[PDB]
Design a protein around this ligand. Sequence first.
Ligand code: HEM
Ligand code: HEM
Ligand SMILES: [O]
Ligand SMILES: [O]
Lengths: 362, 363
Amino acid sequence: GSAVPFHGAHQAGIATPVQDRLHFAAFDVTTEDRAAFVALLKEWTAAARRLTAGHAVGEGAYGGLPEAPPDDTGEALGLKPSRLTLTIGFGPSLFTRFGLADLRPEALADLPKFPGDNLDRARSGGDLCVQACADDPQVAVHAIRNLARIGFGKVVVRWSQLGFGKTSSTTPDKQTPRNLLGFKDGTRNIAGTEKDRLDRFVWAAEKDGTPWMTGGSYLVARRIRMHIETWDRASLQEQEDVFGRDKGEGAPVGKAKERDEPFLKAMKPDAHVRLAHPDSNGGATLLRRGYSFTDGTDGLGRLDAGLFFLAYQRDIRTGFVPVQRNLATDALNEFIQHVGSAVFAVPPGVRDADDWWGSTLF
Amino acid sequence: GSAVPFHGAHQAGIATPVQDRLHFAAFDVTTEDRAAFVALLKEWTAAARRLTAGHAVGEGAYGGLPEAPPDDTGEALGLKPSRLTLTIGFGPSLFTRFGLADLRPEALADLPKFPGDNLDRARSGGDLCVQACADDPQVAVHAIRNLARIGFGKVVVRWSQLGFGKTSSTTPDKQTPRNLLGFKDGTRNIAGTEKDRLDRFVWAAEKDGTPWMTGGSYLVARRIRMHIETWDRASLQEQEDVFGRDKGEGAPVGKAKERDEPFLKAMKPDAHVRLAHPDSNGGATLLRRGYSFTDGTDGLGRLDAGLFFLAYQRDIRTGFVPVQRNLATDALNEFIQHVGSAVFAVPPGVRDADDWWGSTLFG
Ligand code: HEM
Ligand code: HEM
Ligand SMILES: [O]
Ligand SMILES: [O]
């Protein structure tokens, strides 16, 4: 239940080992006062320092003046830091405010429309996001809930997604988690230890064209419904054919071990791994960091379940966009549907205790 | 602990230690065939035996005939039993089927309308329920998902609730968990160790008037929204006055320790503990076993937080109903709203590997 350092050239929550649980919130800004928004970012940064150390925000959750509401709502008392990370991003829509228009990064591209999209606009977009990842779901919910409260009057919660289990890995030496289709998910990703690959594929560089984004990254979120009724009636072979790996061990078809390298020509041409592989996409590589969800029932007698997909990359135009375009013929398409979407510019890290979220932009 | 025994005179998941996470599903029955429903109960019991031992259902999640769908959907492979318990209950509407109307227990009382109810009927009721509790939410979700799959064609999922963190205790010797209002919740409950209180307040007895229910219990579920923005703008003193305990230690007003017994007169007369206490309700006592939830946002820019309240008792008429009736004036009502409700008759335990869920009811 240890604590992930909050400061760094890069924000935590990206290369960091993937924590077991997720609370993701998109916010919309309701103030048009740049000074007030800057003040919010500083307050938020200070609260995140405490929250990620497992401490209450401000003066605490109790023991203050009886006539004052407590600084912290208290539901994380007695819990551990739980490897909490808090990662902020800025949406394209934010750059219509605070005189920021000319600072929107080129690499923060709006996505094209994709075949089979059914995007719920109310569960899409957002002026900004906060990604809360922790091994304890209540540590994550508490962070989001208290950030929202601190921002009362200046921002609102547009949409929020709980992820009950991870479907990603930045630690290939560790057990790979499974998604709700029963397959290991995260085998061939990017590790936090592969500093070279993160520099190449994840972190924006000064020369890419947006100096304030140096050391940040670009994030794509996709809420993906899974047609579990359809999947659960499919034979084992069909499921294995869909991905290009076997279900039990997770090894590429033909091979014996999960982490044996794919031999792509042995997979079906519409196999998910074959279409998504960097070698099929001009080298394009993603840091996938998604989680599973279930939100009630569909009103039709079935659980509503899916995968809240997250992908970090140096440039949306060289990462998610080409790979997703190449999944147009993916056999997995028969079993999923994209029903929410948003993109964000994730600024560089909080350098020290004097720095604050977004300082390079503001 | 890593696992909880599935067999017993009682179903596990009631008096046993409260696990960290919840997946609760209410099902509606679609078949009119009693034998086929009995077949489902047997299949389900077999699956629960495996699931609660951390094993896949049926022949497993892979390694079968490549042309056959796997028996288990696989998302619990490599996970642990995680103290998983699976607890089944039977709703009033179940007894309108399979020629059972005269076997519905009197202690399975319908709830009355309560002041302030705003019940979503689609997230209320149900012919039956399965309570899945485990420390790992994926283990719980996997159990519900495979039970629903196994049952398809004979049952559908009416509504389902994820509980991301507990707000109850049956083990006072460990730390008491906090709810989304920031208060310890579970301090004065019924412990697994209190055999006599469980017999008095939780387990149905043969003499109560429904012999097949001997050893079972009766379950009330309430989905309670929390008006969290309003709560967080109230002063610490107002919050503590709402409950009658202080927020930090959870001690009754005027006392120093969480588990000091309350002095109720020192609380505001509309304080939640004072109104809910057995001494204010003719001795009526509950075994609370609920969890917190968040399900997205309201329409309006604010999280949709709340408490998925669960209460086990020997007779709904002498448990939840009187206590909830007394919360009509609760100061807590300013900050909550009941938006979902169901009741269920939870049968006695699966005695051995030959037994099955509901066997005392169906024969
Ligand atoms: C519900 C939706 C999805 C499911 C269930 C899923 C599942 C999987 C599985 C089982 C693997 C193989 C193990 C692994 O390498 O992680 C995989 C690999 C991968 N997936 Fe997905 N995926 C989904 C959506 C996506 C999307 C939307 C993208 C990008 C637009 C994507 C990109 C990738 C990539 C790049 C790999 C690695 C392939 C390699 O380099 O070997 N996936 N996914
Ligand atoms: C969001 C809804 C609720 C919240 C936040 C809440 C919170 C609390 C808290 C903080 C306590 C004191 C700690 C403890 O002893 O557990 C408590 C006690 C209690 N609550 Fe609730 N409660 C809620 C709903 C209910 C409902 C609906 C009932 C019954 C109908 C109920 C019955 C009780 C009882 C019986 C006690 C213990 C009384 C005693 O000390 O003997 N609660 N509750
Ligand atoms: O993926
Ligand atoms: O409670």
